[PDB]
Amino acid sequence: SGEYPTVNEIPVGEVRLYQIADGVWSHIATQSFDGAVYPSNGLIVRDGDELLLIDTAWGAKNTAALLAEIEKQIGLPVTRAVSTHFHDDRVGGVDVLRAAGVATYASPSTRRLAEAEGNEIPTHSLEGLSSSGDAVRFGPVELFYPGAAHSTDNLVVYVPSANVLYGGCAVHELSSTSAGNVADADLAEWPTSVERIQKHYPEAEVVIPGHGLPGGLDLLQHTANVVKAHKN
Ligand SMILES: C[C@@H](c1cccc2c(-c3ccc4c(c3)CC(=O)N4)c(C(=O)O)[nH]c12)N1C[C@]2(C[C@@H](CN)C2)OC1=O
Ligand SMILES: [Zn+2]
Ligand SMILES: [Zn+2]
């Protein structure tokens, strides 16, 4: 009823949207992994009379439910999607999107890692993002490669019209006591990558983590703190 929706409030298989700013929504879904249930976020950005999707809803059935919820709540077609790293909470559902006519994109680094790991593979490669600090425009957003953090390929997304920074899994929510799933992370480089984000997007007003509640710029420093302490 207006609060940001949380893990125990979303049954696995259902999707909720949350209005972040004019023409910007997050999407929230839940999934089970190794016997525990987790929420995860993505983004939706209005692109004229079309929509740009950032990240799947973590699984084929969740992503079908996402498309249905978008049609119910927004009613504009999703024409393109970008996956921000190669894990299943970002690409799981790409096959569903591709069969619904959505053009799917990711960096070549993400596409190679997804293919090698057996995850679903976005169709189109996003060049111009291979060096830390790189940025490219993609419809109504800017894509930025900050360096290795949660994964070596992780991208962040900025919506300049609304000063919304979608950090993906390289950014953690404020209540987080942990660095999350660090299986593919670079804990040594992560603070440096966060510092690059902070330097590049100093006017961000909303910061959205890959899992959990949005907040302000403090999420970035908090993320560096939690990662450094995890490493310690
Ligand atoms: C799918 C995602 C995934 C699956 C399940 C959980 C997560 C989490 C997470 C977020 C917050 C949080 C925790 C975990 C615990 C905690 O306490 N708070 C995150 C994230 O941090 O982005 N990603 C998760 N995979 C799986 C894996 C690939 C590798 C295969 N060998 C293992 O690596 C990930 O990232
Ligand atoms: Zn991940
Ligand atoms: Zn994640």
CATH of the domain at 214: 3.60.15.10
**Does some domain include residue 159?**
yes
Count of domains forming the chain: 1
Cα dihedral: 174, 6, 119, 75 (round 10): -110
**Catalytic site residue from 27, 55, 62, 85:** 85
| 200 tagged catalytic | no
Separation of 142 CA from ligand 1 center, angstroms?
A: 25
CA 108/CA 219 separation, integer angstroms: 28
Separation of 153 CA from ligand 2 center, angstroms?
A: 10
Task: Give whole-number Cα distances, 131 to 23, 128, 188, 226, 228, in Å.
Answer: 30, 8, 17, 25, 23
Beta strands of 131-175 (E only): which ranges? 135-138, 141-144, 156-159, 164-168
Tokens of 163: 């000063």
CA 8/CA 205 separation, integer angstroms: 27
| 222 tagged catalytic | no
Q: Could you list the residue range(s) of the whole structural domain that residue 154 is in? A: 7-231
Cβ neighbour number for residue 193 with a 10 Å cutoff: 24
| 27 tagged catalytic | no
Tokens of 69: 């919820």
Pocket test for ligand 1, best of 37, 63, 87, 227 (most atoms within 8 A of CB): 87
Residue type at position 16: R
Which value in Å is the resolution of this experimental model?
Answer: 1.4
For the CA of 33, the closest atom of ligand 1 is 5
Instruction: Give residues with Cβ within 8 angstroms of 112, minimum separation 6.
Output: none
Pocket test for ligand 1, best of 7, 181, 226, 230 (most atoms within 8 A of CB): 181
106 three-class SS = strand
CA 155/CA 87 separation, integer angstroms: 12
| Edge-first strand listing for the sheet containing 206-209 | 135-138, 141-144, 156-159, 164-168, 206-209
Task: Give whole-number Cα distances, 208 to 16, 87, 172, 214, in Å.
Answer: 15, 18, 8, 4
| 230 tagged catalytic | no
CA 138/CA 80 separation, integer angstroms: 10
207 three-class SS = strand
What residues does ligand 1 touch, defined as CB less than 6 Å away?
Answer: 33, 38, 87-89, 150, 169, 178, 180-181, 183-184, 210-211
Method: X-ray
**Does some domain include residue 130?**
yes
**Does some domain include residue 1?**
no
**Does some domain include residue 2?**
no
Q: What is the largest CA-CA distance in the chain?
A: 48
**Catalytic site residue from 95, 181, 184, 186:** 181
**Does some domain include residue 185?**
yes
**Does some domain include residue 145?**
yes
Q: Inter-axis angle of helices 190-200 and 218-231, to 10 degrees?
A: 170
In DSSP terms, 106 is beta-bridged to 125
Q: Is 189 annotated as a binding residue?
A: no
